[PDB]
Design a protein around this ligand. Structure first.
Ligand code: FES
Length: 95
């Protein structure tokens, strides 16, 4: 649904993420490969960083408030509230 740009280590990819759809799910659907392990919001495997737009990552229990203020997001659980630009594969820098 909302136009989402994934800036991944292999390039920028635009996809349409439907409302109520997690970023991870829509990307997989599109055929993109993004990191993940628990898929429940309790690790940092699927860590990304929101560059613009907003998401609802209310389900997550891993990031502290300062991390969220910084723009860190758990892509397996985040649902877009607008058009977004997100950096993926963020654990690979800041585990
Ligand atoms: S895969 Fe564990 S929080 Fe997203």
């Amino acid at each position: 649904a909302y136009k989402t740009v994934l800036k991944t280590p292999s390039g920028e990819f635009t996809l349409d993420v439907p409302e109520g759809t997690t970023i991870l799910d829509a990307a997989e659907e599109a055929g993109y490969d993004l990191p993940f392990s628990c898929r429940a919001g309790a690790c940092s495997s699927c860590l990304g960083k929101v560059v613009s737009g907003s998401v609802d990552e209310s389900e997550g229990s891993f990031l502290d408030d300062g991390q969220m203020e910084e723009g860190f997001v758990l892509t397996c659980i985040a649902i877009p509230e607008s058009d977004l630009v997100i950096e993926t594969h963020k654990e690979e820098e800041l585990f």
